[PDB]
JSON list of C-alpha atoms and ligand atoms in Angstrom, two decimals:
[
{"chain": "A", "resi": 1, "resn": "UNK", "atom": "CA", "xyz": [18.27, 12.13, 14.69]},
{"chain": "A", "resi": 2, "resn": "UNK", "atom": "CA", "xyz": [15.12, 11.71, 12.65]},
{"chain": "A", "resi": 3, "resn": "UNK", "atom": "CA", "xyz": [13.28, 14.54, 10.82]},
{"chain": "A", "resi": 4, "resn": "UNK", "atom": "CA", "xyz": [9.72, 15.53, 11.49]},
{"chain": "A", "resi": 5, "resn": "UNK", "atom": "CA", "xyz": [7.38, 17.65, 9.41]},
{"chain": "A", "resi": 6, "resn": "UNK", "atom": "CA", "xyz": [3.85, 18.96, 10.09]},
{"chain": "A", "resi": 7, "resn": "UNK", "atom": "CA", "xyz": [1.56, 19.70, 7.11]},
{"chain": "A", "resi": 8, "resn": "UNK", "atom": "CA", "xyz": [-1.56, 21.73, 7.65]},
{"chain": "A", "resi": 9, "resn": "UNK", "atom": "CA", "xyz": [-3.78, 23.62, 5.11]},
{"chain": "A", "resi": 10, "resn": "UNK", "atom": "CA", "xyz": [-2.50, 21.44, 2.35]},
{"chain": "A", "resi": 11, "resn": "UNK", "atom": "CA", "xyz": [-3.27, 19.01, -0.49]},
{"chain": "A", "resi": 12, "resn": "UNK", "atom": "CA", "xyz": [-1.24, 16.05, -1.78]},
{"chain": "A", "resi": 13, "resn": "UNK", "atom": "CA", "xyz": [-1.01, 13.55, -4.66]},
{"chain": "A", "resi": 14, "resn": "UNK", "atom": "CA", "xyz": [-0.94, 9.91, -3.61]},
{"chain": "A", "resi": 15, "resn": "UNK", "atom": "CA", "xyz": [-0.11, 8.59, -7.08]},
{"chain": "A", "resi": 16, "resn": "UNK", "atom": "CA", "xyz": [2.90, 11.07, -7.19]},
{"chain": "A", "resi": 17, "resn": "UNK", "atom": "CA", "xyz": [4.29, 9.75, -3.92]},
{"chain": "A", "resi": 18, "resn": "UNK", "atom": "CA", "xyz": [3.55, 6.04, -4.46]},
{"chain": "A", "resi": 19, "resn": "UNK", "atom": "CA", "xyz": [5.24, 6.09, -7.85]},
{"chain": "A", "resi": 20, "resn": "UNK", "atom": "CA", "xyz": [8.59, 6.30, -6.06]},
{"chain": "A", "resi": 21, "resn": "UNK", "atom": "CA", "xyz": [8.01, 3.95, -3.17]},
{"chain": "A", "resi": 22, "resn": "UNK", "atom": "CA", "xyz": [7.84, 0.11, -2.98]},
{"chain": "A", "resi": 23, "resn": "UNK", "atom": "CA", "xyz": [5.92, -0.43, 0.17]},
{"chain": "A", "resi": 24, "resn": "UNK", "atom": "CA", "xyz": [6.80, -3.64, 1.99]},
{"chain": "A", "resi": 25, "resn": "UNK", "atom": "CA", "xyz": [4.55, -3.58, 5.05]},
{"chain": "A", "resi": 26, "resn": "UNK", "atom": "CA", "xyz": [2.08, -1.24, 6.71]},
{"chain": "A", "resi": 27, "resn": "UNK", "atom": "CA", "xyz": [0.52, -1.83, 10.12]},
{"chain": "A", "resi": 28, "resn": "UNK", "atom": "CA", "xyz": [-1.98, 0.54, 11.81]},
{"chain": "A", "resi": 29, "resn": "UNK", "atom": "CA", "xyz": [-5.33, 0.88, 13.48]},
{"chain": "A", "resi": 30, "resn": "UNK", "atom": "CA", "xyz": [-8.04, 3.54, 13.64]},
{"chain": "A", "resi": 31, "resn": "UNK", "atom": "CA", "xyz": [-7.31, 4.42, 9.95]},
{"chain": "A", "resi": 32, "resn": "UNK", "atom": "CA", "xyz": [-6.33, 2.81, 6.66]},
{"chain": "A", "resi": 33, "resn": "UNK", "atom": "CA", "xyz": [-4.23, 3.81, 3.70]},
{"chain": "A", "resi": 34, "resn": "UNK", "atom": "CA", "xyz": [-7.42, 3.74, 1.60]},
{"chain": "A", "resi": 35, "resn": "UNK", "atom": "CA", "xyz": [-8.99, 6.11, 4.11]},
{"chain": "A", "resi": 36, "resn": "UNK", "atom": "CA", "xyz": [-5.97, 8.54, 3.88]},
{"chain": "A", "resi": 37, "resn": "UNK", "atom": "CA", "xyz": [-6.46, 8.59, 0.06]},
{"chain": "A", "resi": 38, "resn": "UNK", "atom": "CA", "xyz": [-10.16, 9.43, 0.35]},
{"chain": "A", "resi": 39, "resn": "UNK", "atom": "CA", "xyz": [-11.08, 11.33, 3.48]},
{"chain": "A", "resi": 40, "resn": "UNK", "atom": "CA", "xyz": [-9.98, 14.65, 4.73]},
{"chain": "A", "resi": 41, "resn": "UNK", "atom": "CA", "xyz": [-8.30, 15.07, 8.13]},
{"chain": "A", "resi": 42, "resn": "UNK", "atom": "CA", "xyz": [-7.40, 18.04, 10.27]},
{"chain": "A", "resi": 43, "resn": "UNK", "atom": "CA", "xyz": [-3.63, 17.68, 10.49]},
{"chain": "A", "resi": 44, "resn": "UNK", "atom": "CA", "xyz": [-0.81, 15.40, 9.25]},
{"chain": "A", "resi": 45, "resn": "UNK", "atom": "CA", "xyz": [2.36, 14.74, 11.18]},
{"chain": "A", "resi": 46, "resn": "UNK", "atom": "CA", "xyz": [5.11, 12.73, 9.40]},
{"chain": "A", "resi": 47, "resn": "UNK", "atom": "CA", "xyz": [8.20, 11.24, 10.92]},
{"chain": "A", "resi": 48, "resn": "UNK", "atom": "CA", "xyz": [10.76, 9.39, 8.80]},
{"chain": "B", "resi": 1, "resn": "UNK", "atom": "CA", "xyz": [-2.47, -15.64, -9.82]},
{"chain": "B", "resi": 2, "resn": "UNK", "atom": "CA", "xyz": [1.25, -14.85, -9.85]},
{"chain": "B", "resi": 3, "resn": "UNK", "atom": "CA", "xyz": [2.54, -12.05, -7.55]},
{"chain": "B", "resi": 4, "resn": "UNK", "atom": "CA", "xyz": [5.99, -11.70, -5.98]},
{"chain": "B", "resi": 5, "resn": "UNK", "atom": "CA", "xyz": [6.38, -11.87, -2.26]},
{"chain": "B", "resi": 6, "resn": "UNK", "atom": "CA", "xyz": [8.04, -8.41, -2.26]},
{"chain": "B", "resi": 7, "resn": "UNK", "atom": "CA", "xyz": [4.51, -6.99, -2.77]},
{"chain": "B", "resi": 8, "resn": "UNK", "atom": "CA", "xyz": [2.63, -9.25, -0.34]},
{"chain": "B", "resi": 9, "resn": "UNK", "atom": "CA", "xyz": [1.38, -6.15, 1.49]},
{"chain": "B", "resi": 10, "resn": "UNK", "atom": "CA", "xyz": [-0.39, -4.90, -1.66]},
{"chain": "B", "resi": 11, "resn": "UNK", "atom": "CA", "xyz": [-3.15, -7.44, -1.17]},
{"chain": "B", "resi": 12, "resn": "UNK", "atom": "CA", "xyz": [-3.45, -6.60, 2.58]},
{"chain": "B", "resi": 13, "resn": "UNK", "atom": "CA", "xyz": [-6.83, -5.16, 3.63]},
{"chain": "B", "resi": 14, "resn": "UNK", "atom": "CA", "xyz": [-6.95, -1.43, 3.52]},
{"chain": "B", "resi": 15, "resn": "UNK", "atom": "CA", "xyz": [-4.08, -0.96, 1.09]},
{"chain": "B", "resi": 16, "resn": "UNK", "atom": "CA", "xyz": [-4.28, 1.90, -1.40]},
{"chain": "B", "resi": 17, "resn": "UNK", "atom": "CA", "xyz": [-2.13, 0.68, -4.29]},
{"chain": "B", "resi": 18, "resn": "UNK", "atom": "CA", "xyz": [-3.35, 0.00, -7.79]},
{"chain": "B", "resi": 19, "resn": "UNK", "atom": "CA", "xyz": [-3.67, -3.77, -7.39]},
{"chain": "B", "resi": 20, "resn": "UNK", "atom": "CA", "xyz": [-6.34, -3.61, -4.67]},
{"chain": "B", "resi": 21, "resn": "UNK", "atom": "CA", "xyz": [-8.23, -0.87, -6.66]},
{"chain": "B", "resi": 22, "resn": "UNK", "atom": "CA", "xyz": [-8.26, -1.88, -10.34]},
{"chain": "B", "resi": 23, "resn": "UNK", "atom": "CA", "xyz": [-7.00, -5.51, -10.28]},
{"chain": "B", "resi": 24, "resn": "UNK", "atom": "CA", "xyz": [-8.38, -8.27, -8.08]},
{"chain": "B", "resi": 25, "resn": "UNK", "atom": "CA", "xyz": [-10.07, -6.88, -4.98]},
{"chain": "B", "resi": 26, "resn": "UNK", "atom": "CA", "xyz": [-10.84, -9.40, -2.25]},
{"chain": "B", "resi": 27, "resn": "UNK", "atom": "CA", "xyz": [-14.36, -10.10, -1.04]},
{"chain": "B", "resi": 28, "resn": "UNK", "atom": "CA", "xyz": [-14.46, -10.45, 2.75]},
{"chain": "B", "resi": 29, "resn": "UNK", "atom": "CA", "xyz": [-18.14, -11.27, 3.37]},
{"chain": "B", "resi": 30, "resn": "UNK", "atom": "CA", "xyz": [-17.34, -14.99, 3.17]},
{"chain": "B", "resi": 31, "resn": "UNK", "atom": "CA", "xyz": [-14.67, -17.10, 4.90]},
{"chain": "B", "resi": 32, "resn": "UNK", "atom": "CA", "xyz": [-11.58, -16.54, 2.78]},
{"chain": "B", "resi": 33, "resn": "UNK", "atom": "CA", "xyz": [-8.01, -17.72, 3.05]},
{"chain": "B", "resi": 34, "resn": "UNK", "atom": "CA", "xyz": [-5.28, -15.92, 1.05]},
{"chain": "B", "resi": 35, "resn": "UNK", "atom": "CA", "xyz": [-2.15, -18.12, 0.68]},
{"chain": "B", "resi": 36, "resn": "UNK", "atom": "CA", "xyz": [1.12, -16.86, -0.58]},
{"chain": "B", "resi": 37, "resn": "UNK", "atom": "CA", "xyz": [2.95, -20.06, -1.82]},
{"chain": "B", "resi": 38, "resn": "UNK", "atom": "CA", "xyz": [6.22, -20.41, -3.58]},
{"chain": "B", "resi": 39, "resn": "UNK", "atom": "CA", "xyz": [6.47, -23.36, -6.01]},
{"chain": "B", "resi": 40, "resn": "UNK", "atom": "CA", "xyz": [10.01, -24.62, -6.19]},
{"chain": "B", "resi": 41, "resn": "UNK", "atom": "CA", "xyz": [11.86, -25.09, -9.49]},
{"chain": "B", "resi": 42, "resn": "UNK", "atom": "CA", "xyz": [12.17, -28.89, -9.46]},
{"chain": "B", "resi": 43, "resn": "UNK", "atom": "CA", "xyz": [8.49, -29.61, -8.91]},
{"chain": "B", "resi": 44, "resn": "UNK", "atom": "CA", "xyz": [7.53, -26.79, -11.32]},
{"chain": "B", "resi": 45, "resn": "UNK", "atom": "CA", "xyz": [9.71, -28.36, -14.05]},
{"chain": "B", "resi": 46, "resn": "UNK", "atom": "CA", "xyz": [8.04, -31.70, -13.19]},
{"chain": "B", "resi": 47, "resn": "UNK", "atom": "CA", "xyz": [4.45, -30.89, -13.86]},
{"chain": "B", "resi": 48, "resn": "UNK", "atom": "CA", "xyz": [4.99, -28.48, -16.79]},
{"chain": "C", "resi": 1, "resn": "LIG", "atom": "C1", "xyz": [-0.97, 13.46, -9.77]},
{"chain": "C", "resi": 1, "resn": "LIG", "atom": "O1", "xyz": [-2.31, 13.33, -9.83]},
{"chain": "C", "resi": 1, "resn": "LIG", "atom": "C2", "xyz": [-2.82, 13.75, -11.22]},
{"chain": "C", "resi": 1, "resn": "LIG", "atom": "C3", "xyz": [-4.30, 13.59, -11.20]},
{"chain": "C", "resi": 1, "resn": "LIG", "atom": "O2", "xyz": [-4.83, 14.03, -9.95]},
{"chain": "C", "resi": 1, "resn": "LIG", "atom": "C4", "xyz": [-2.11, 12.79, -12.29]},
{"chain": "C", "resi": 1, "resn": "LIG", "atom": "O3", "xyz": [-2.36, 13.57, -13.53]},
{"chain": "C", "resi": 1, "resn": "LIG", "atom": "C5", "xyz": [-2.29, 12.84, -14.75]},
{"chain": "C", "resi": 1, "resn": "LIG", "atom": "O4", "xyz": [-1.01, 12.48, -15.24]},
{"chain": "C", "resi": 1, "resn": "LIG", "atom": "C6", "xyz": [-0.96, 11.78, -16.52]},
{"chain": "C", "resi": 1, "resn": "LIG", "atom": "C7", "xyz": [0.50, 11.52, -16.76]},
{"chain": "C", "resi": 1, "resn": "LIG", "atom": "O5", "xyz": [1.09, 10.97, -15.59]},
{"chain": "C", "resi": 1, "resn": "LIG", "atom": "C8", "xyz": [-1.58, 12.74, -17.58]},
{"chain": "C", "resi": 1, "resn": "LIG", "atom": "O6", "xyz": [-1.56, 12.05, -18.81]},
{"chain": "C", "resi": 1, "resn": "LIG", "atom": "C9", "xyz": [-1.17, 12.90, -19.87]},
{"chain": "C", "resi": 1, "resn": "LIG", "atom": "O7", "xyz": [-2.32, 13.46, -20.46]},
{"chain": "C", "resi": 1, "resn": "LIG", "atom": "C10", "xyz": [-2.07, 14.33, -21.62]},
{"chain": "C", "resi": 1, "resn": "LIG", "atom": "C11", "xyz": [-3.35, 14.92, -22.00]},
{"chain": "C", "resi": 1, "resn": "LIG", "atom": "O8", "xyz": [-3.38, 15.30, -23.36]},
{"chain": "C", "resi": 1, "resn": "LIG", "atom": "C12", "xyz": [-1.51, 13.42, -22.71]},
{"chain": "C", "resi": 1, "resn": "LIG", "atom": "O9", "xyz": [-1.35, 14.15, -23.93]},
{"chain": "C", "resi": 1, "resn": "LIG", "atom": "C13", "xyz": [-0.24, 12.80, -22.28]},
{"chain": "C", "resi": 1, "resn": "LIG", "atom": "O10", "xyz": [0.33, 11.89, -23.33]},
{"chain": "C", "resi": 1, "resn": "LIG", "atom": "C14", "xyz": [-0.41, 12.05, -20.89]},
{"chain": "C", "resi": 1, "resn": "LIG", "atom": "O11", "xyz": [-1.10, 10.88, -21.29]},
{"chain": "C", "resi": 1, "resn": "LIG", "atom": "C15", "xyz": [-2.98, 13.13, -17.22]},
{"chain": "C", "resi": 1, "resn": "LIG", "atom": "O12", "xyz": [-3.58, 14.03, -18.09]},
{"chain": "C", "resi": 1, "resn": "LIG", "atom": "C16", "xyz": [-3.05, 13.72, -15.78]},
{"chain": "C", "resi": 1, "resn": "LIG", "atom": "N1", "xyz": [-4.45, 14.04, -15.40]},
{"chain": "C", "resi": 1, "resn": "LIG", "atom": "C17", "xyz": [-4.84, 15.25, -15.01]},
{"chain": "C", "resi": 1, "resn": "LIG", "atom": "C18", "xyz": [-3.81, 16.33, -14.92]},
{"chain": "C", "resi": 1, "resn": "LIG", "atom": "O13", "xyz": [-5.94, 15.43, -14.67]},
{"chain": "C", "resi": 1, "resn": "LIG", "atom": "C19", "xyz": [-0.69, 12.67, -12.11]},
{"chain": "C", "resi": 1, "resn": "LIG", "atom": "O14", "xyz": [-0.17, 11.51, -12.81]},
{"chain": "C", "resi": 1, "resn": "LIG", "atom": "C20", "xyz": [-0.27, 12.46, -10.63]},
{"chain": "C", "resi": 1, "resn": "LIG", "atom": "N2", "xyz": [1.18, 12.52, -10.53]},
{"chain": "C", "resi": 1, "resn": "LIG", "atom": "C21", "xyz": [2.04, 11.57, -10.87]},
{"chain": "C", "resi": 1, "resn": "LIG", "atom": "C22", "xyz": [3.49, 11.82, -10.73]},
{"chain": "C", "resi": 1, "resn": "LIG", "atom": "O15", "xyz": [1.66, 10.49, -11.30]},
{"chain": "C", "resi": 2, "resn": "EIC", "atom": "C1", "xyz": [4.38, 5.45, 1.20]},
{"chain": "C", "resi": 2, "resn": "EIC", "atom": "C2", "xyz": [4.48, 6.95, 1.14]},
{"chain": "C", "resi": 2, "resn": "EIC", "atom": "C3", "xyz": [5.57, 7.45, 2.10]},
{"chain": "C", "resi": 2, "resn": "EIC", "atom": "C4", "xyz": [5.29, 9.02, 2.33]},
{"chain": "C", "resi": 2, "resn": "EIC", "atom": "C5", "xyz": [3.89, 9.33, 2.81]},
{"chain": "C", "resi": 2, "resn": "EIC", "atom": "C6", "xyz": [3.77, 10.65, 3.53]},
{"chain": "C", "resi": 2, "resn": "EIC", "atom": "C7", "xyz": [2.81, 11.53, 3.42]},
{"chain": "C", "resi": 2, "resn": "EIC", "atom": "C8", "xyz": [1.52, 11.49, 2.65]},
{"chain": "C", "resi": 2, "resn": "EIC", "atom": "C9", "xyz": [0.32, 11.29, 3.59]},
{"chain": "C", "resi": 2, "resn": "EIC", "atom": "C10", "xyz": [-0.64, 10.43, 3.45]},
{"chain": "C", "resi": 2, "resn": "EIC", "atom": "C11", "xyz": [-0.78, 9.43, 2.33]},
{"chain": "C", "resi": 2, "resn": "EIC", "atom": "C12", "xyz": [-0.99, 8.01, 2.92]},
{"chain": "C", "resi": 2, "resn": "EIC", "atom": "C13", "xyz": [0.02, 7.01, 2.37]},
{"chain": "C", "resi": 2, "resn": "EIC", "atom": "C14", "xyz": [-0.55, 5.80, 1.65]},
{"chain": "C", "resi": 2, "resn": "EIC", "atom": "C15", "xyz": [-0.07, 4.44, 2.25]},
{"chain": "C", "resi": 2, "resn": "EIC", "atom": "C16", "xyz": [0.07, 3.36, 1.24]},
{"chain": "C", "resi": 2, "resn": "EIC", "atom": "C17", "xyz": [0.32, 2.00, 1.85]},
{"chain": "C", "resi": 2, "resn": "EIC", "atom": "C18", "xyz": [0.45, 0.85, 0.84]},
{"chain": "C", "resi": 2, "resn": "EIC", "atom": "O1", "xyz": [0.44, 1.17, -0.38]},
{"chain": "C", "resi": 2, "resn": "EIC", "atom": "O2", "xyz": [0.63, -0.27, 1.27]},
{"chain": "C", "resi": 3, "resn": "NAG", "atom": "C1", "xyz": [19.66, 16.42, 12.95]},
{"chain": "C", "resi": 3, "resn": "NAG", "atom": "O1", "xyz": [18.83, 16.57, 11.85]},
{"chain": "C", "resi": 3, "resn": "NAG", "atom": "C2", "xyz": [18.62, 17.97, 11.53]},
{"chain": "C", "resi": 3, "resn": "NAG", "atom": "C3", "xyz": [17.57, 17.98, 10.42]},
{"chain": "C", "resi": 3, "resn": "NAG", "atom": "O2", "xyz": [18.25, 18.23, 9.13]},
{"chain": "C", "resi": 3, "resn": "NAG", "atom": "C4", "xyz": [19.93, 18.65, 11.14]},
{"chain": "C", "resi": 3, "resn": "NAG", "atom": "O3", "xyz": [19.70, 20.03, 10.92]},
{"chain": "C", "resi": 3, "resn": "NAG", "atom": "C5", "xyz": [20.94, 18.48, 12.22]},
{"chain": "C", "resi": 3, "resn": "NAG", "atom": "O4", "xyz": [22.18, 18.99, 11.82]},
{"chain": "C", "resi": 3, "resn": "NAG", "atom": "C6", "xyz": [21.05, 17.01, 12.61]},
{"chain": "C", "resi": 3, "resn": "NAG", "atom": "N1", "xyz": [22.01, 16.80, 13.67]},
{"chain": "C", "resi": 3, "resn": "NAG", "atom": "C7", "xyz": [23.05, 15.96, 13.65]},
{"chain": "C", "resi": 3, "resn": "NAG", "atom": "C8", "xyz": [23.27, 15.22, 12.43]},
{"chain": "C", "resi": 3, "resn": "NAG", "atom": "O5", "xyz": [23.83, 15.83, 14.60]}
]
């Protein structure tokens, strides 16, 4: 039973979030974590 | 340089942490090979 949130019309601080998380592995294509910290995208859907 | 294996994904391409931004940033225009090696204690005490 995993939670899902959708964030639209929003702004966020990457340094605030990454100060609390020790990332061990990221895998993805069509985008990069550097791109998510620089570019602007239409919507953001997060599952955790 | 020295870096723990718990943050081996920090040097992965596309990462957005502070190491890949302000510290050593890898150049990928030439054939590289990043190696994460662990030097054991006995051979480390042998060669100072
Ligand atoms: C969220 O992002 C903002 C920037 O987009 C980060 O803001 C900066 O935070 C540091 C402290 O974490 C601030 O430093 C402080 O500055 C005052 C200025 O006089 C100084 O007196 C203090 O001793 C301290 O050094 C810095 O000013 C601030 N920059 C801004 C607001 O433009 C913030 O760190 C990020 N959030 C987290 C949780 O890291
Ligand atoms: C790790 C953060 C967890 C929560 C993130 C959720 C929402 C924020 C949305 C976009 C920011 C992109 C995350 C940056 C990934 C860093 C990967 C790494 O440093 O290797
Ligand atoms: C599933 O998660 C939602 C989100 O908080 C919660 O409201 C719900 O009670 C959960 N259901 C369970 C634990 O059976």
